[PDB]
């Protein structure tokens, strides 16, 4: 049965990682990483999370299965983060949330749900995006089409190209939007651009699918949800796939959510019953520990305050590295302005380096980025910034 | 897009559960439950698990993502449980294990892997089986066909009917086997019957898929794997979907494994690369906490001993209830043979009650079983056995 199976394509991520580990040079630097690191180069467990885990160790008396949609408090806390306390969507019971194994798990549940219960055949994704978006949607039998996004000359949102691309989208297509901190570019729509897109989406009959993996890493929890909430105010229907992997530092515990929104409570409940069937046929019901930590923290005033400040510390450290990177580069020698780095949001930015410059940075200087030129600014520290920048300047 | 979606079918499980909850009668009894309960009617966190969770709280310093296939130690320990320490499959590196979100997650990964990378179109499942088997395989686009299994006259394995049924299976079809503790019947092949089936499967070109959710609940860890190991000795290729939900009491942490076996190490590694691709496009990588507890316990002599004895305590309590149920039915005036209950394995048995008897049980006596007559003998205790049996005798 298995003798003729073709090996999966290479996987550049695992990948880049292995080469970096094998590298014997001082002082090699990994900017290809996909997680947050603090100023010491570690990805610690958040203190709020440790405190919550201690509470669960002390208080859990069973591991009995959760419901298919997971912990109810997790679902309520999730909708308040997405839509805001007092949102009409919440008041009108127009939204149902399933706890999922990570943001990826939410995307796949959304995809399976749409493939089996609607006429959706196609999902529009930005070029560039997270590379697993195409894999997830194709796995459910959905075609992925790309829309233009990045102005490589100005390192900005090519808004005109975006709108032009998306005019090829038919009514009933899904259009995926990164809620904030676009991966890989760090370039997000302004609020006014979000509002324009919301209006266009209504007119053209798109189903919006928000991928919200970095809430809190651009400007703040509420600010980062402005775009989503502009869409929510304009649409009867939408889906949100959110993730707590980065903003709770809970990557490996697989903590995310798929939130379904419809015109009213009867419609969303009926539709959500099929979303639950899609979950049942995949992993049956979701892993408690990470989501329980999230619910425990979000619903406790003391823990939530500690967590919100840890998330603010992460957001602020990323911003300090963006500033320190620009200063260190090019007040000391470099190319057509790197100030675009200060305006971008989240852990990631395209550096503007070519695939060959990136290879030369790996081979000659032991500095690792992804072939697209994406760098994770949280892999930067005050201590490694000077050598990093000296290497970059050398390949310009 | 969602206005015309059809509601998912009713869900008899949630279902039975809700009706039971709402029932205001003493002394209602729930035998429809799908988990272990101890003699006090609780489903505790195992002590070994609590000890491991304390160790992880003390020692974890990151939640950074696991690899796609999860914790390596979890994989090694899983293969030793399945195949035995010193198995040729292990020595010859013919097996690859992915940590998955529960046994359900393992089944879905197997199904996606098979649908996308092989010519498999059909999976044969016993009639009866766990009702989610059909949903999982269908979700991946695979047809499910049923083979005969249960002799309702003798409360035994209808081995002739099984073999006759399966002769309609074509070469290249998947045949699913429950490894031990068949759900819902508690009826397992004898070792000689497993050996006959292993020979037949080789001759007919079936791909065996073992669903191994109750290792340790029939006779013991090694004994319960005899059937699987008889197949492993005879086949180049097979898949195992195992679960740690029941035997570690880790239901909601979603802890299972999908183990792929091929003729040699080159073939299994190449095929496993596509199994990892199937995982990546689903939930990306698996939840650490439950599997880490399992690896921590299995790889530590002290914890493993505490855990093996807790599992033995569960197996033995189930056996004591089987005996007490048969004795008490006799003593309450059932004038018929229930001795078949003593020979069946695991938490579940068909009581032999009709769907109407089961409804009458619920309505007149507040005793809840599944409509098929399946009862969970771990819902039985020395204290509730007499009323339970009085009610049953009353509807015979
Ligand atoms: C845009 C985007 N979508 C989804 C994911 C997947 O997140 P998770 O690890 O929670 O599955 C990521 C990576 N955090 C991402 O960047
Ligand atoms: C035969 C069978 N297969 C798989 C499962 C699902 O197990 P899990 O909860 O680990 O996904 C069950 C329920 N334990 C089962 O009885």
UniProtKB/Swiss-Prot annotation, chains A, B:
Listed GO CC annotations: cytoplasm; cytosol
Similarity remark: Belongs to the class-I pyridoxal-phosphate-dependent aminotransferase family.
Effect of residue 65 to F/S: Slight changes in activity
Name of the top EC class for this enzyme: transferase
Compartments, record wording: Cytoplasm
Induction of expression: Transcription is increased specifically in response to 2,4,6-trinitrotoluene (TNT) and its indicator compounds 1,3-DNB, 2,4-DNT, and 2,6-DNT.
Name by which UniProt lists this protein: Aspartate aminotransferase
Keywords: Aminotransferase, Cytoplasm, Pyridoxal phosphate, Transferase
N6-(pyridoxal phosphate)lysine modifications at: 246
SUPFAM superfamilies: PLP-dependent transferases
UniProt keyword Glycoprotein, yes or no: no
Name of a matching Pfam family: Aminotran_1_2
Organism from which the protein derives: Escherichia coli (strain K12)
Catalytic activity as recorded in UniProt: L-aspartate + 2-oxoglutarate = oxaloacetate + L-glutamate
């Amino acid at each position: 049965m298995f003798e003729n199976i073709t090996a999966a394509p290479a996987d550049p991520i695992l990948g880049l990682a292995d080469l970096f580990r094998a590298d014997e040079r001082p002082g090699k630097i990994n900017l290809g990483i996909g997680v947050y690191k603090d100023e010491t180069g570690k990805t610690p467990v958040l203190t709020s999370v440790k405190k919550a885990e201690q509470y669960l160790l002390e208080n859990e008396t069973t591991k009995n299965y959760l419901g298919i949609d997971g912990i109810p408090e997790f679902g309520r806390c999730t909708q308040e983060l997405l839509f805001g306390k007092g949102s009409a969507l919440i008041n009108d019971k127009r939204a149902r949330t399933a706890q999922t194994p990570g943001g990826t798990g939410a995307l796949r549940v959304a995809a399976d749900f749409l493939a089996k219960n609607t006429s959706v055949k196609r999902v529009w994704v930005s070029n560039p995006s997270w590379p697993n978006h195409k894999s997830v949607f194709n796995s459910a039998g959905l075609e992925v089409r790309e829309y233009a996004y990045y102005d490589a000359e100005n390192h900005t949102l090519d808004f005109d190209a975006l709108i032009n691309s998306l005019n090829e989208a038919q009514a009933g297509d899904v259009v995926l939007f990164h809620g904030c901190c676009h991966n890989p570019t760090g370039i997000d729509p302004t609020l006014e651009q979000w509002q324009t897109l919301a209006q266009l989406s209504v007119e053209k009959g798109w189903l919006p699918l928000f991928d919200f993996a970095y809430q809190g890493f651009a400007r703040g929890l509420e600010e980062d949800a402005e775009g989503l909430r502009a869409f929510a105010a304009m649409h009867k229907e939408l889906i949100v796939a959110s993730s707590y992997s980065k903003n709770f530092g809970l990557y490996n515990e697989r903590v995310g959510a798929c939130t379904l929104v419809a015109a009213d409570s009867e419609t969303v409940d009926r539709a959500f019953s099929q979303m639950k069937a899609a979950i049942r046929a995949n992993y049956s019901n979701p892993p408690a520990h990470g989501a329980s930590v999230v619910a425990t923290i979000l619903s406790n005033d003391a823990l939530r305050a500690i967590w919100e400040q840890e998330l603010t510390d992460m957001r602020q450290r990323i911003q300090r590295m963006r500033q320190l990177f620009v200063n260190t580069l090019q007040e000391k020698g470099a190319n057509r302005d790197f100030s675009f780095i200060i305006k971008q949001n989240g852990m990631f930015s395209f550096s503007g380096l070519t695939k060959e410059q990136v290879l030369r940075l790996r081979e000659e200087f032991g500095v690792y980025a992804v072939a697209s030129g994406r760098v994770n600014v949280a892999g930067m520290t005050p201590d490694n910034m000077a050598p990093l920048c000296e290497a970059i300047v050398a390949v310009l």
